[PDB]
Amino acid sequence: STGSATTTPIDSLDDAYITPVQIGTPAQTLNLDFDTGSSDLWVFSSETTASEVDGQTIYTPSKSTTAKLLSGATWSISYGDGSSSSGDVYTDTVSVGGLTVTGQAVESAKKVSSSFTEDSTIDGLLGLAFSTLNTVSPTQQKTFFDNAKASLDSPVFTADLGYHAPGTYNFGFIDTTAYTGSITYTAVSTKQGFWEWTSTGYAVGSGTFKSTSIDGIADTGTTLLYLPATVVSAYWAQVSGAKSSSSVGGYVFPCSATLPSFTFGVGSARIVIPGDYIDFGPISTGSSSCFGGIQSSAGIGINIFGDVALKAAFVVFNGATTPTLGFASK
Ligand SMILES: NCc1ccc(-c2ccco2)nc1
């Protein structure tokens, strides 16, 4: 089997991407944030505290003839950005782009933090990291990908995120028309439950490539590119007037600037992030100070190749017995 679904930016900044997902019988379609940095499929639901729902589409398990309460199971997750959610668990039929998994754990939110409530466009998350990170207790549950894997034509999924445009998540096949050149594969460590890999270095603009190992995670659920402070300083030093603002919470730059590109290495290959991808717009409405898309990971404990990086590439999440990542230009 295979599946193929379009993923759409939630706003004009590509702050996140939503992908329609069919849950239950008859289908209830929710727009989920596919997150290769976590491993829970959770949804706003008829069980979510009413005051914490503001415009989201909800899953109502009582209206699904295939929903079953997973007795005794609860979940609770906190994300790196400080947001969180928790609740109970159903199993139900879940389909993405024509690929169907029966008996998928669908984690129904009883509580969500304010940032989820405040984002009407995201109806939940679909985790695509390794199932070892799944938070369901007392019996940990598998991700959609892990459940689907054996049925897929090839045990892979691909992320092809658009810049200011829709893109595609494919399951079970590699669309050889979706990228240019070749896909360079690189080793993955699953020890922390992430798609963790080591970039071979970077360049800023037309500058020389610096060969240096940068260990980080491929995370579709993180907006920005978080890298070591040395790398980030080298980037922003090329932008007149850019500075790190403690009050704003990162590097800002004059909105009048034209940003340089940023290149990262994948083995001997190079992925170029155009400068425009690094502009996250005014820090507040009407400001001429703009927020940068490359930020320091210093306070995080891990480097994160988020959407800013991934959307410059066609990315293969190879879930073979020994997982690997592939990157191609596009
Ligand atoms: N990096 C995981 C992740 C994904 C989405 C969100 C999110 C959406 C709306 C508010 O917060 N937060 C964290």
Q: Ligand 1 pocket test: which of 18, 34, 54, 81 has the largest number of ligand atoms within 8 Å of its C-beta?
A: 81
Which ranges constitute the DSSP H helices of 13-170? 114-117, 144-149
What resolution in angstroms does the PDB record give? Answer: 1.1
Sign of CA dihedral 281, 287, 289, 294: negative
- Cβ-contact 4, 151 below 8 angstroms: no
Residues with CB under 6 A from ligand 1: 16, 33, 35, 37-38, 79-81, 83, 115-116, 119, 122, 125, 221-222
- Cβ-contact 134, 40 below 8 angstroms: yes
Q: How was this structure determined?
A: X-ray
Give me the residue spans of the domains in the chain.
5-174, 175-330
Closest C-alpha among 123, 93, 121 to residue 105: 93
Angle at 61 between CA 59 and CA 67, to 5 degrees: 125
Question: Which two structure tokens, joined as six digits, stand for 298?
Answer: 């210093």
| Residue ID of nearest Cα to ligand 1 atom 3 | 221
CATH topology of domain 5-174: Cathepsin D, subunit A; domain 1 (2.40.70)
Contacts of residue 162, defined as CB under 8 A and 6 or more positions apart, other chains included, come to: 7, 9, 14, 311
Which ranges constitute the DSSP H helices of the chain? 114-117, 144-149, 229-236, 307-310
d(CA 253, CA 243): 6
Classify domain 175-330 at the CATH class level: mainly beta
Catalytic positions, please?
35, 199
Q: Which residue has 């379609």 as its token pair?
A: 29
d(CA 153, CA 95): 16
| C-alpha 123 to ligand 1 mean position (Å) | 11
| C-alpha 214 to ligand 1 mean position (Å) | 24
- Cβ-contact 38, 221 below 8 angstroms: yes
5-174 and 175-330 share one CATH topology? Answer: yes
d(CA 300, CA 37): 14
Angle at 237 between CA 328 and CA 220, to 5 degrees: 35
Q: Which residue has 């800023």 as its token pair?
A: 204
If phi > 0 it is left, if psi is from -120 to 50 it is alpha, else beta; for residue 69 that is beta
The pair phi, psi for residue 121, each rounded to 5°, is -85, -15
Closest C-alpha among 161, 153, 157 to residue 144: 157
Parallel, antiparallel or unpaired: strands 41-43 and 99-112:
parallel
